[PDB]
Structure formats: C-alpha cells, structure tokens
Amino acid sequence: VWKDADTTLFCASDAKAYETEVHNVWATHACVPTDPNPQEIHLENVTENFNMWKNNMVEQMHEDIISLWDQSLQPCVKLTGGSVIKQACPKISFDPIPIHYCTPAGYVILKCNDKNFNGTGPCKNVSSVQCTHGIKPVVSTQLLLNGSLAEEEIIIRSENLTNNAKTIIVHLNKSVEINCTRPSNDIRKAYCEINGTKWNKVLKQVTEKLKEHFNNKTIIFQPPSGGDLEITMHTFNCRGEFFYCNTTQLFNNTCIGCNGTITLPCKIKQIINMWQGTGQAMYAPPIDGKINCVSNITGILLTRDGGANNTSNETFRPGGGDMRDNWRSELYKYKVVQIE
Ligand SMILES: CN1CCN(C(=O)N2CCC[C@H](C(=O)Nc3ccc(Cl)c(F)c3)C2)CC1
Ligand SMILES: *[C@@H]1O[C@H](CO)[C@@H](O)[C@H](O)[C@H]1NC(C)=O
Ligand SMILES: *[C@@H]1O[C@H](CO)[C@@H](O)[C@H](O)[C@H]1NC(C)=O
Ligand SMILES: *[C@@H]1O[C@H](CO)[C@@H](O)[C@H](O)[C@H]1NC(C)=O
Ligand SMILES: *[C@@H]1O[C@H](CO)[C@@H](O)[C@H](O)[C@H]1NC(C)=O
Ligand SMILES: *[C@@H]1O[C@H](CO)[C@@H](O)[C@H](O)[C@H]1NC(C)=O
Ligand SMILES: *[C@@H]1O[C@H](CO)[C@@H](O)[C@H](O)[C@H]1NC(C)=O
Ligand SMILES: *[C@@H]1O[C@H](CO)[C@@H](O)[C@H](O)[C@H]1NC(C)=O
Ligand SMILES: *[C@@H]1O[C@H](CO)[C@@H](O)[C@H](O)[C@H]1NC(C)=O
Ligand SMILES: *[C@@H]1O[C@H](CO)[C@@H](O)[C@H](O)[C@H]1NC(C)=O
Ligand SMILES: *[C@@H]1O[C@H](CO)[C@@H](O)[C@H](O)[C@H]1NC(C)=O
Ligand SMILES: *[C@@H]1O[C@H](CO)[C@@H](O)[C@H](O)[C@H]1NC(C)=O
Ligand SMILES: *[C@@H]1O[C@H](CO)[C@@H](O)[C@H](O)[C@H]1NC(C)=O
Ligand SMILES: [Cl-]
Ligand SMILES: [Cl-]
Ligand SMILES: [Cl-]
Incomplete structure (x- = not known):
C-alpha cells in the first residue's frame, strides 16, 4: 500500500576517486556508491498512473545539475543581471557520467515497463525499485x-x-x-x-x-x-x-x-x-x-x-x-x- 508523495531524494554514482573530471568530482562528494545488488519487484495485476510532465524528480535532478555546473564550469565573467561576477576559468575536464536517483527509507520508486508508455496515464506492467537507472545529465x-x-x-x-x-x-x-x-x-x-x-x-x-x-x-x-x-x-x-x-x-x-x-x-x-x-x-x-x-x-x-x-x-x-x-x-x- 502506498500513495503519491514527494520527498528529498539522494543520488548514486560510479564516480572514481582521483579522476579530475567534473561530474566525477561532484558525484564523489554529493552521491553515494551504486547499490551493488539492486532489486526490482514486479507488482502483479497493478495499474498505476504516471505523469512525466508533473514529476518532482525532474525538478530535483534539475537542481542537482544546476549545482554541478555552478561548481564545475565557472565562467571568467558572469553578467548575471547587473552583477559582474569575476573569477578564474581554468579549462576543466568535462564528460557526464550516469547518476541514479534513490528514495529514502519510507518511500519507493515505481517504474513503468509498458513498452508503449508515452509518459502520461495508466501503466499496466509496474515494478518497484529503490533507484532509477544511470542517467547521464546531458545538456x-x-x-x-x-x-x-x-x-x-x-x-x-x-x-x-x-x-x-x-x-x-x-x-x-x-x-x-x-x-x-x-x-x-x-x-x-x-x-x-x-x-x-x-x-x-x-x-x-x-x-x-x-x-x-x-x-x-x-x-x-x-x-x-x-x-x-x-x-x-x-x-x-x-x-x-x-x-x-x-x-x-x-x-x-x-x-x-x-x-x-x-x-x-x-x-x-x-x-x-x-x-x-x-x-x-x-x-x-x-x-x-x-x-x-x-x-x-x-x-x-x-x-x-x-x-x-x-x-x-x-x-x-x-x-x-x-x-x-x-x-x-x-x-x-x-x-x-x-x-x-
Ligand atoms: C527558465 N530558464 C530561464 C533562463 N533560461 C533562458 O533564459 N534561456 C534563453 C537562452 C538560451 C537558454 C539555453 O538553453 N542555454 C544553453 C546554454 C548552454 C548549453 Cl550547452 C545549452 F544547451 C543551452 C534558455 C533558461 C530557462
Ligand atoms: C568523426 O569525424 C572525424 C573527422 O571527419 C573522423 O576522423 C572520424 O573517423 C569520424 N568518426 C568517428 C567515430 O570519430
Ligand atoms: C548510413 O546508413 C545507411 C543504412 O541506413 C548505410 O547504407 C550508409 O552506408 C550509412 N552512411 C555511411 C556514410 O556509411
Ligand atoms: C521504430 O518504430 C517505427 C514506428 O514508427 C517502426 O516502423 C520501426 O520499424 C522501428 N525501428 C526499429 C529499428 O525498431
Ligand atoms: C490515416 O491514414 C491511414 C492510411 O494508412 C488510414 O488507414 C487511417 O484511417 C487514417 N487515420 C486518420 C486518423 O487520419
Ligand atoms: C489541452 O489544450 C487544449 C487547447 O488549449 C485545451 O482545450 C485542453 O483543455 C487542454 N487539455 C487539458 C487537459 O487541459
Ligand atoms: C498517452 O496514453 C494515454 C493512455 O493511453 C492517452 O490518454 C494519452 O492521450 C497519450 N498521450 C499522447 C501524447 O499520445
Ligand atoms: C484550434 O483548435 C483546437 C481544437 O481543435 C482548439 O483547442 C484551439 O483553441 C484552436 N485554436 C484557435 C486559435 O482557434
Ligand atoms: C513486465 O516487465 C517486467 C520487467 O522487465 C518483465 O517481467 C516482463 O517484461 C513483463 N512481464 C510480463 C509478465 O509480461
Ligand atoms: C549509441 O547507440 C548504440 C546503438 O544504439 C549503442 O550500442 C551505444 O551504446 C550508444 N552510445 C552511447 C555512448 O550511448
Ligand atoms: C556522448 O557520449 C560519448 C561516449 O561516452 C562521449 O564521447 C560524448 O562526448 C558524449 N557527448 C556529449 C555531448 O556529452
Ligand atoms: C543556418 O544556415 C542557413 C544556410 O544554410 C542560413 O540560412 C541560416 O540563417 C543559418 N541559421 C542561423 C540561425 O543563422
Ligand atoms: C530553410 O528554411 C530557411 C528558413 O530558416 C530558408 O532560408 C531556406 O530557404 C530553407 N531551405 C531550403 C532548402 O529551401
Ligand atoms: Cl545506497
Ligand atoms: Cl539516507
Ligand atoms: Cl536561439
């Protein structure tokens, strides 16, 4: 038993230590390691409604990627509405890695396995997971x-x-x-x-x-x-x-x-x-x-x-x-x- 709800999520990476690539650094200090044993539960005879255009997971990932770019790709000058923020802009190493999004204890993620799913309305082959798959945040x-x-x-x-x-x-x-x-x-x-x-x-x-x-x-x-x-x-x-x-x-x-x-x-x-x-x-x-x-x-x-x-x-x-x-x-x- 469950109902639609919103909570603070956390992220999971396969970020490597010592690697200077910016996504690796951000995910090293901001995400946990991947679940080595990730388990999915098919829910027999369960139909769940989804709305991809009204999903708080989207906004949380967005805020994450904003923070990542804010800490990694620092421009020499940023004219951010009247403000002239100046700083260094060393050339950095840039290549996005997959990020996983995971629910805390008490919540769970439901995932649609309908091969025709368009992102809106009912889903008939639903499974339960703790984390999404690895999503590269490609701008x-x-x-x-x-x-x-x-x-x-x-x-x-x-x-x-x-x-x-x-x-x-x-x-x-x-x-x-x-x-x-x-x-x-x-x-x-x-x-x-x-x-x-x-x-x-x-x-x-x-x-x-x-x-x-x-x-x-x-x-x-x-x-x-x-x-x-x-x-x-x-x-x-x-x-x-x-x-x-x-x-x-x-x-x-x-x-x-x-x-x-x-x-x-x-x-x-x-x-x-x-x-x-x-x-x-x-x-x-x-x-x-x-x-x-x-x-x-x-x-x-x-x-x-x-x-x-x-x-x-x-x-x-x-x-x-x-x-x-x-x-x-x-x-x-x-x-x-x-x-x-
Ligand atoms: C809502 N919120 C308000 C401010 N925003 C905005 O004013 N925009 C207008 C000008 C272009 C913007 C864009 O897409 N820039 C961009 C920069 C680098 C890369 Cl690599 C890229 F793929 C895209 C969209 C964003 C939306
Ligand atoms: C991509 O373009 C460059 C320049 O034409 C070429 O050398 C290369 O073989 C192309 N293909 C790949 C897979 O990089
Ligand atoms: C593009 O794809 C077609 C198959 O759809 C292939 O025949 C063709 O060789 C490809 N283009 C190049 C430059 O190889
Ligand atoms: C992709 O989907 C179209 C339907 O618009 C279908 O006709 C086509 O065979 C599909 N292509 C592949 C490679 O599965
Ligand atoms: C669209 O065209 C196809 C032709 O392949 C026809 O069978 C179908 O009835 C048409 N449907 C609509 C909604 O226009
Ligand atoms: C979709 O857009 C049309 C055109 O504005 C509108 O008539 C309709 O109410 C919209 N659908 C919903 C669910 O709001
Ligand atoms: C997605 O599927 C649902 C249910 O089949 C339908 O109501 C909706 O109109 C579809 N959306 C699009 C964009 O086709
Ligand atoms: C165009 O038609 C759609 C429905 O067919 C309607 O929702 C929309 O308001 C119409 N737009 C104009 C400018 O008449
Ligand atoms: C529903 O999706 C799950 C997840 O991959 C898998 O068991 C299968 O593709 C579907 N199950 C059935 C009974 O069709
Ligand atoms: C590009 O597409 C091929 C075939 O669809 C896939 O095997 C490959 O993993 C893709 N490359 C990347 C970098 O995702
Ligand atoms: C897409 O993935 C390939 C394979 O890792 C990578 O080389 C390329 O830089 C990526 N493209 C972008 C725009 O991140
Ligand atoms: C893209 O190139 C075409 C010429 O092939 C040109 O007419 C068009 O203005 C270009 N786009 C932009 C945004 O300048
Ligand atoms: C493409 O559309 C542009 C408008 O952006 C126009 O300049 C051009 O005539 C079009 N291309 C062709 C091949 O006609
Ligand atoms: Cl974990
Ligand atoms: Cl936790
Ligand atoms: Cl533009």
Whole structure:
C-alpha cells in the first residue's frame, strides 16, 4: 500500500576517486556508491498512473545539475543581471557520467515497463525499485544526445498534443550518430557529420508517427523562428566547450541525390545565454588541439506551429531551452510514492 508523495531524494554514482573530471568530482562528494545488488519487484495485476510532465524528480535532478555546473564550469565573467561576477576559468575536464536517483527509507520508486508508455496515464506492467537507472545529465537543445531509446516504436511525448505551447519530445527507437569536431590549428570553426541515409529514414518515420497523432495532416519540418542562438541552433557542450551547430540541413533538406554525409557548420562560442537561469556567461577561447565528441541522437525536441487549425498541415520546429524536458526524457517512467 502506498500513495503519491514527494520527498528529498539522494543520488548514486560510479564516480572514481582521483579522476579530475567534473561530474566525477561532484558525484564523489554529493552521491553515494551504486547499490551493488539492486532489486526490482514486479507488482502483479497493478495499474498505476504516471505523469512525466508533473514529476518532482525532474525538478530535483534539475537542481542537482544546476549545482554541478555552478561548481564545475565557472565562467571568467558572469553578467548575471547587473552583477559582474569575476573569477578564474581554468579549462576543466568535462564528460557526464550516469547518476541514479534513490528514495529514502519510507518511500519507493515505481517504474513503468509498458513498452508503449508515452509518459502520461495508466501503466499496466509496474515494478518497484529503490533507484532509477544511470542517467547521464546531458545538456543540449534541439537534439537529445546519449540517452535511452524507445523499446519498439517511436514514442511521442507531450503533456497535451492539442496545446501548441506544450513541447513535444520524440523518443527514437534507433539512435543516429552525430560526430562533431573542431580540428587542431578560425579556432572557433567546427562541424558535425551525420549519416544522411540514416537521418532521413529516421525523420520520415518520425513524420509518419506524427501523422498518426494529427488526423493524417501533412507534417512539415522547418527551422526555428527566432531565438537566442542556443535555441535556433543545436547547442551542446563537448569537452567543456560550447558548440552551436546549424541544423537546417536536418529539418529542411527535404529528402522525404541525398543519401550521403551531412556536414553541419558549427561555432564554439565564448559568450553564452545560460540555461540554469537568465544571465550571460563568458568563458575563454577553445583548448588547443582536436576537440571531438561522437554522440547518439536518441530524441528530438519539437514545437508545433499555431494557427494551422484551418490548414491541412502541421509544421514542427526543433526546440529546447528548458533542460527539465531533457531530464524528463529519461525520468518519464518513474514516480515516487510514500509507502503506507
Ligand atoms: C527558465 N530558464 C530561464 C533562463 N533560461 C533562458 O533564459 N534561456 C534563453 C537562452 C538560451 C537558454 C539555453 O538553453 N542555454 C544553453 C546554454 C548552454 C548549453 Cl550547452 C545549452 F544547451 C543551452 C534558455 C533558461 C530557462
Ligand atoms: C513486465 O516487465 C517486467 C520487467 O522487465 C518483465 O517481467 C516482463 O517484461 C513483463 N512481464 C510480463 C509478465 O509480461
Ligand atoms: C549509441 O547507440 C548504440 C546503438 O544504439 C549503442 O550500442 C551505444 O551504446 C550508444 N552510445 C552511447 C555512448 O550511448
Ligand atoms: C521504430 O518504430 C517505427 C514506428 O514508427 C517502426 O516502423 C520501426 O520499424 C522501428 N525501428 C526499429 C529499428 O525498431
Ligand atoms: C498517452 O496514453 C494515454 C493512455 O493511453 C492517452 O490518454 C494519452 O492521450 C497519450 N498521450 C499522447 C501524447 O499520445
Ligand atoms: C489541452 O489544450 C487544449 C487547447 O488549449 C485545451 O482545450 C485542453 O483543455 C487542454 N487539455 C487539458 C487537459 O487541459
Ligand atoms: C568523426 O569525424 C572525424 C573527422 O571527419 C573522423 O576522423 C572520424 O573517423 C569520424 N568518426 C568517428 C567515430 O570519430
Ligand atoms: C548510413 O546508413 C545507411 C543504412 O541506413 C548505410 O547504407 C550508409 O552506408 C550509412 N552512411 C555511411 C556514410 O556509411
Ligand atoms: C490515416 O491514414 C491511414 C492510411 O494508412 C488510414 O488507414 C487511417 O484511417 C487514417 N487515420 C486518420 C486518423 O487520419
Ligand atoms: C543556418 O544556415 C542557413 C544556410 O544554410 C542560413 O540560412 C541560416 O540563417 C543559418 N541559421 C542561423 C540561425 O543563422
Ligand atoms: C530553410 O528554411 C530557411 C528558413 O530558416 C530558408 O532560408 C531556406 O530557404 C530553407 N531551405 C531550403 C532548402 O529551401
Ligand atoms: C556522448 O557520449 C560519448 C561516449 O561516452 C562521449 O564521447 C560524448 O562526448 C558524449 N557527448 C556529449 C555531448 O556529452
Ligand atoms: C484550434 O483548435 C483546437 C481544437 O481543435 C482548439 O483547442 C484551439 O483553441 C484552436 N485554436 C484557435 C486559435 O482557434
Ligand atoms: Cl545506497
Ligand atoms: Cl539516507
Ligand atoms: Cl536561439
């Protein structure tokens, strides 16, 4: 017996001692070691309701990642609303590791094992756990990288598909590799390579799944309509450097003579509109040498256009900005309950 409840969670890592990587340091002092014997209990003939868009676990992970970045990626200057906070900005080692989220004594986490679960409503194959799985806290926009995959069909996640202000999260069932490099000695010029055949097959599957959700209206893809740069381009952190990569060849190279390698131009930016809170951070120029990260695109952040009620189309643009949807894309299958 149990009921929905919220409590202070704790985290669990496989952080290594002596390793200077920032996630390792943070998790070494802020998390416990992984449960070496983690036990799950299937609950026979139990249906439990979940809401991924209203889940306090999301906000707690968010607060954790804010604190991590606050202690690790210190910008040279931070213009944080009139304030000019100055400090050192040594180049650090940066590579996210999996974090587990665990309930204290008296509470438990319920986890949905429905292979079709969209994050909202009833779940029929429920199990009980003490900790989530290892979730890498990957900050990104437009594309979710290095996450899990849907176990069968592509899942569409939204708090309300008919409300165009509510973000759509696409959960892919087959990752697509994005391979990004800034070559060794424009020091801020970089680029990302993606397989065109794989990308366009995945995007065609995505449009047809979307067609299932919008009475077979024609699904159109377009790039963002205004933003700060962090939203209009695919923005991520690779080895401590902030990459901004133009993706109109992803959402506007129709191919729905193009089955080859897509190259997206990129810039490493020093001034950044932060995601942790409104304000500006200025870091230092990129490190010397080859800067490379090979990531899996495992989900997409989308926003549907409004005012197409009286049209036969629905146009979607890549989105992002609020990283709680990033954590939501992995925490969707979890919810905390107080055990009575
Ligand atoms: C709610 N809360 C308020 C303040 N916020 C904001 O004002 N934003 C507007 C400008 C862009 C912001 C962003 O996403 N920055 C970013 C920076 C680095 C990386 Cl690697 C990245 F992937 C993304 C979103 C955040 C949301
Ligand atoms: C429900 O999910 C659990 C967890 O993996 C597993 O036993 C199986 O996939 C499902 N059980 C049944 C009886 O289908
Ligand atoms: C990328 O995807 C492949 C296949 O889906 C998977 O085996 C691999 O673990 C993924 N890479 C990372 C870094 O998660
Ligand atoms: C992914 O899901 C789609 C459904 O939209 C399905 O047609 C496709 O076969 C799936 N791909 C894989 C690799 O399972
Ligand atoms: C998710 O599934 C529930 C129950 O099947 C349904 O009510 C809800 O509309 C679905 N959400 C989406 C976005 O498809
Ligand atoms: C979803 O959005 C539509 C459009 O604004 C609204 O009519 C509907 O009430 C919303 N659903 C819920 C559950 O609030
Ligand atoms: C990624 O891109 C670089 C530069 O084109 C290339 O050397 C490398 O082989 C590519 N693939 C991987 C897996 O790094
Ligand atoms: C992209 O994936 C397809 C299979 O979907 C494969 O035939 C092709 O070789 C891949 N691209 C490259 C550059 O190898
Ligand atoms: C969508 O189109 C398919 C064609 O494969 C058709 O069978 C189905 O009835 C249509 N459904 C809606 C909701 O438009
Ligand atoms: C991305 O590149 C295209 C040219 O291919 C350009 O029209 C567009 O303005 C670029 N995006 C941004 C945000 O500048
Ligand atoms: C892509 O959309 C942009 C608007 O951001 C526009 O500049 C361009 O014409 C479109 N691409 C193609 C290939 O038409
Ligand atoms: C994604 O995971 C790979 C494998 O560990 C890593 O090399 C890459 O840097 C990661 N990408 C990001 C953006 O963290
Ligand atoms: C568009 O239609 C949906 C329901 O089909 C409704 O909830 C929404 O308010 C409408 N928007 C406008 C601007 O008429
Ligand atoms: Cl423990
Ligand atoms: Cl404890
Ligand atoms: Cl933007």
